[PDB]
Design a binder for this molecule. Sequence first.
Ligand SMILES: Cc1cc2nc3c(=O)[nH]c(=O)nc-3n(C[C@H](O)[C@H](O)[C@H](O)COP(=O)(O)OP(=O)(O)OC[C@H]3O[C@@H](n4cnc5c(N)ncnc54)[C@H](O)[C@@H]3O)c2cc1C
Ligand SMILES: NC(=O)c1ccc[n+]([C@@H]2O[C@H](COP(=O)([O-])OP(=O)(O)OC[C@H]3O[C@@H](n4cnc5c(N)ncnc54)[C@H](OP(=O)(O)O)[C@@H]3O)[C@@H](O)[C@H]2O)c1
Ligand SMILES: CC(C)=CCc1ccc2c(C[C@H](N)C(=O)O)c[nH]c2c1
Length: 426
Amino acid sequence: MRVCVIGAGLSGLAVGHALKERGISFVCLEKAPDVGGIWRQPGAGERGPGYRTLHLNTAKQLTGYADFPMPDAYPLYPRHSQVAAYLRSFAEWAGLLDHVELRTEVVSVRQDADGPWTVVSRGADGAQVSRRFEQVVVASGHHNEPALPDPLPAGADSFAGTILHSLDYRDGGDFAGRRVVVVGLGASAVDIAADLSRHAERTLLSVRRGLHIVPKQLFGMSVDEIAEAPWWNEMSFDERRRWVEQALLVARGRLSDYGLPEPDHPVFSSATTLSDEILSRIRHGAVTPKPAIASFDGDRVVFTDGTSEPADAVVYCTGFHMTFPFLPAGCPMSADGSVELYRRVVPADRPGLYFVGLVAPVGAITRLVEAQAEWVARLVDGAAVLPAADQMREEIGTYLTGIVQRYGRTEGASIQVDVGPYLAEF
Ligand SMILES: Cc1cc2nc3c(=O)[nH]c(=O)nc-3n(C[C@H](O)[C@H](O)[C@H](O)COP(=O)(O)OP(=O)(O)OC[C@H]3O[C@@H](n4cnc5c(N)ncnc54)[C@H](O)[C@@H]3O)c2cc1C
Ligand SMILES: NC(=O)c1ccc[n+]([C@@H]2O[C@H](COP(=O)([O-])OP(=O)(O)OC[C@H]3O[C@@H](n4cnc5c(N)ncnc54)[C@H](OP(=O)(O)O)[C@@H]3O)[C@@H](O)[C@H]2O)c1
Ligand SMILES: CC(C)=CCc1ccc2c(C[C@H](N)C(=O)O)c[nH]c2c1
């Protein structure tokens, strides 16, 4: 009645918990047959950003909800199925599921001239019902639309095999004995290449721009555990860079010597891909680093180095586009494509709309959405207040002009957040 929460992944669940703890009435509308967001999608053979080898790359005690620790027997890096079971178990404990409408997909969201939002959902029956809510919290995730490169390499339409995205990818088993090209050097790409490296006859890793490939662990410490260590925050943002790049070279050496393009920037600058596997896979010949794909010649994939390989499939791990089809005008955005959300949550012109989980921190997103949810709940029932709109576009302004200072234009830096200072403001 008061709050329609769109999404029952980790963020929607935190919002529902936050609202339930303030006595605030809400319903949570979720597409999938259950809660958990992406973490339950592999496990149901569902097409989504995950895959059957997906584990957390953040430590469990930093990723679990603050008031609801993951089972003690869980490893540091739980499998997607353990996370999904954890999330379902959270919804049960927090008393959330009777406020959750499963198999219910939100299709339009419009602000009515009196303040309330009209929300049109489509259910199992394919039927549609239109409802009014005081406020709407968007918790729909930002891995919604696959982002293929533009353009495809030439000859893609004549390709003998399957051109697919990591969305359509679930299990390397589905490629047993086949010759597959993985495109990308991000979390998805190295994981899916690693996974193909034990079922495919041959796995090729086609990379164009170089990324810093960091183990999940230095000094035995998870990289996001170190990020919190006082002695690391004790350190200067150049003293740490050197610490990291010296540590990296003791642990893996230099990327060029694994056949990988060396990045054009230090660590932190741009982005870092986490993997314990992909370098070793290369050194074992299980994955073969290749340059960029330049053309598809029938059954073969031709690379920019003139070399060529027969390939039965190409798996594009080029990331995801952030879209909001149910929002007619869409996430408040800048011409540049930069998100414009006051403190990464709040549109400046539309009262009663909130975006939760649309941040990208170094490490786990959980503490951040827990703080976001707690703030939004206090805004919904009035314990907290927003600046005037101009003043909200000013925080947006200095946050944005500050991300160009750190990442220049990039493309998805408009949701990047320092996990330390952000949480401190809550
Ligand atoms: C491959 C991968 C690995 C990751 N690994 C980590 C990690 O190790 N650690 C970490 O902290 N984070 C990780 N993340 C980040 C991850 O996004 C979050 O950890 C977590 O999934 C929180 O997501 P969420 O709840 O905001 O959204 P999601 O998990 O995407 O859930 C959003 C929900 O919106 C629902 N929805 C309902 N109605 C609609 C509608 N009408 N339109 C659209 N959607 C709708 C979808 O069904 C979905 O369930 C990873 C992400 C990816 C893609
Ligand atoms: N869990 C984590 O640690 C983590 C970290 C960061 C992001 N994520 C999320 O996970 C999602 C999955 O993507 P990912 O991070 O695994 O991979 P990614 O970082 O999005 O993929 C990087 C690769 O994109 C390729 N690329 C080049 N031009 C491109 C273009 N115009 N459009 C798209 N891609 C282009 C580059 O080489 P090629 O052209 O050779 O492929 C590059 O190696 C992302 O969307 C992100 O939101 C998760
Ligand atoms: C000390 C050091 C080099 C840290 C580098 C680092 C650590 C964690 C992450 C994550 C976590 C989570 N998977 C997310 O995407 O929210 C993404 N990128 C990261 C980079």
